[model samples]
Target: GSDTTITQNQTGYDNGYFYSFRTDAPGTVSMTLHSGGSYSTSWRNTGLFVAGKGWSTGGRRTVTYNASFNPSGNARLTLYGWTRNPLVSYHIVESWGTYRPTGTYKGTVTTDGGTYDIYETWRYNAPSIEGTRTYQQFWSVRQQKRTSGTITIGNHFDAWARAGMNLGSHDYQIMATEGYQSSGSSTVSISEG
Candidate 1:
């Protein structure tokens, strides 16, 4: 296992996986990434997360992930990514620890045997994949939380589009383990189909 430790913000490609870690408060986050989009993370008050594999283009695709999540305090495990052109951030939340993302209610997207509530928000001069800047955020939060499943990402995208939330050119899509004043451990395996 390869362990990578980060204290602030970092992004890299390793073991056939693209990984990113970021934090606002003072804390440490560590990850182990493998070749097949499989990764594990352990962190303390870390704001963001780990491994992702994508074409660097955002639109429609199928994503599969199996995860085991154990989180304490406020945290969330999500399928996260970014888009260019319009520079939008997206999250398909799977499981959360205590806090849930709140914003303007968009609607709901039903897919993959679940219903996901949609929301749109703005990050005003906040941290992003392209450094600190203002941008839109798209969220698809599941009504029922689980640790493992297959996600039809395009379904949510289309749903967002219908709600007037559009995405730009795809950046890197990832299975992120995020924490806010929290601590947790997660192991997830993902693949694009």
Candidate 2:
């Protein structure tokens, strides 16, 4: 179980549908990941960003998890919040933005947990659908080399906007990891509150 190493990771939009994830707390969603490096993926993964359903931005949010890693390469625990405004199609949710959309570097902001370099992407997509759907996504990333411990990211929305970042009601926030094309292994577990 612990010895499994990833080979090729899961792709976008279909993450939750093809991976292990669940709603534990009434207001919370949790996911667990065991990466072998390439594709033991969807543990909310792309062998990079392990996307999980958490919260939409209108209210508040806090994330708590434990990561046990033994990577022989490089990896980062990443988080993203997306706000959608598709003028016509309800067919597309936040899933389309997974690891595909290209964004811009928006600088850094300090939060209750730590400082985060923010990246913002505003878009409407590849669909031939009518109306203009404007989607805004906020990415908060933290780099981890070789460490194993519990991580808690709290009051993320308020903190993001409070620190001069864009404030939007992310329909559903996502959490995952970004790994370089390398080798090794890692595992992460979510603790519900």
Candidate 3:
């Protein structure tokens, strides 16, 4: 039997959760989650969570995904934050080459109560490759409010360079935080890509 079920529980307020998973190789990965009923009105308090290994400072947060640690085969990474608030929102983005990236990707969820919005950006900069480094970055932000919702704040980044002829190893980072101000308690869940 290959069926498996995992459950996570958190007790208290203003607390955060962290989780991670690994894949056989690095081609393309996607993460998805299912929400229960206890989410916020606009899902203002529910979204993805991300943190880096060697470049993060405790609680000081940022909206950047640094893809510098992703190797050719074994790619090590860390991303956390999931809770009971089922009304969660998320977005995905990708960037390549050297240029100031700009565009918009949006996601929205609406219940009988209210609506939620999630925005994403993908940007890249180059020579494309330099020395032993190549650069690429992806970022996503979520916004929550009562009636009309919009992504007024949040951002993320990723970069890589070249290493001679072979593409150098790059690390991937993800960042997710709570949106605006929320009224009630909510939770979020994370699944494999």
Candidate 4:
């Protein structure tokens, strides 16, 4: 049995940020976002992007920053975003070991009264016997404006198996932008359960 969860939040203007977590087994994974707040004319556009390990340079596959879970503990998750006319991004990576299942799963994202866009992606690996697993998850949200904005993202992965099998591993990453060169921001939150 294995279960894991991750969450992320952002605030302010023209700032870059990123966060990550690890899991050890295979099962089900989920991610959600919530937006609630307000913005002023000083603000502009906000958006989000996600990707997996393969997303680095030239990898086999790349998973969005959305959300997901597998029976493996060997996985990585990254979240990044920024606001302003200039382009900015952040990244965080980490790994975990096998784990047990049986836990409540919940993820969410919230933003101030402002236009924002949220995105996410999840990737899972097959199962093994060493009670080990790997996977990835990514997510991002941009706030369109410079006045006031807030965003929150959460995730959960769980597995059910004694000596959990090697539930492969996956990767997740997210990016947010705000400005004329990048996509605009819309107050919105998406979830994959």
Candidate 5:
């Protein structure tokens, strides 16, 4: 199989899929996209691969995926995205690597027939869509981790809103594979349903 290595902020459209990748630390990320919305990705150190649209209105959104994941440490397969107005980063985590993300506990929310623990964290002068800056990160970590599932993203957004963690204008939303100081590989088929 052939693979495409991504550069910083590399983004484009293929057939109908909009794919993007970003690298922060010293490492590389490679991706191969199949014709049927399926993809395989590999990364080292720190990077991410995402498939989704460019921007939205910051409302109801859902993404379904069947993924098989393998990672060394500090990796995640999640619905990751960001916003503009208030400059927020978000993650709806489905699977994780050796370490789980920790922050100030917010609460819990049930969606897609499961309970997800919520956390509100802050990134101080870290990398973001708008470059290095401090911002809030909203998280809904799945209590029961799985490889394949349907994620009702809107539910988590609503839950975060109720918790007073408001989001800004929608930017880009994507189902992503994120690796941090780790080596990982994943195969995923995603769709908007």
Candidate 6:
């Protein structure tokens, strides 16, 4: 019923970025998130994810998989990009945020079984270790929270490009959940279809 598990051990991989994620294996495919771990930050951040780095794409590739998540607390799906690996190199960790993106809706994209309302945003402060100016993010979120089903991320990217945004290029992409306040857990899974 689950593709992977993260219990007491941290399991994740990186191109150059090491991980603190709880896992059973050390390799697989992750989109925006290059690594995932049960987190304990000074701020309120805790959750489970399948995030990692070093793969560029648009919604043209025929990449499809079955993904699902069971969150014990607050959570949201995320797809993000970075100039450098965010975990090992957090300074350049610019990424897309929640439904309230920094910009307005460029357009909507329909692909596979998901209809995504695209959102755009740009920033220079948080989401990274670097503090210079600049990384842009595009989000393709399913109107209905994806609890379980086949997902084609490329379709979302295609819609994003059609929305009058370029989403830019980065070293990696990640898919994760950002839990808050205190301890949280979620089962994020992706299986090829």
Candidate 3 Cα outliers beyond 4 Å, as residue runs: 1-19, 22-60, 63-65, 69-83, 92-193
Candidate 4 versus the native: TM-score? 0.18
Query: What is the Cα-based lDDT of residue 167 in candidate 3?
Result: 18
Question: Can you give the lDDT of residue 103 in candidate 1?
Answer: 81
lDDT of 6 at 123: 64
In candidate 1, what are the lDDT values of residues 1-193, reduced to their tens digit? 4554445556766666676666555446766665567777777765544434333444577977888888887777888899988899999998888877768998999999999999999989987778789999999999989888889999999999999999998987888887776678888777777
Give the per-residue lDDT digits (tens) of candidate 4, residues 140-185.
2222223122222221111111112111233222322112212222
Q: Give Cα distance to truth, residue 162, candidate 4, Å.
A: 28
Give per-residue CA lDDT, model 3, range 106-135, as digits (tens): 344332233333233322332211322223
Off by over 4 Å in 5: 1-8, 25-27, 45-59
Best by TM-score: 1
Each candidate's lDDT (Cα)?
Answer: 0.78, 0.35, 0.23, 0.23, 0.75, 0.40
TM-score of each: 0.88, 0.45, 0.20, 0.18, 0.87, 0.55
| lDDT comparison, 4 vs 5, better candidate | 5
RMSD of 1: 2.3
| Poorly placed runs, candidate 1 (over 4 Å) | 1-8, 25-27, 45-58
Find the 10 residues in a row with the least total lDDT in model 4: 36-45
Give the best candidate by lDDT: 1
Question: Which sequence of candidate numbers ranks them by TM-score, best first?
Answer: 1, 5, 6, 2, 3, 4
Q: What lDDT does candidate 2 reach at residue 44?
A: 22
Query: Which residue pairs come into collision in candidate 1?
Result: 57-170, 58-170
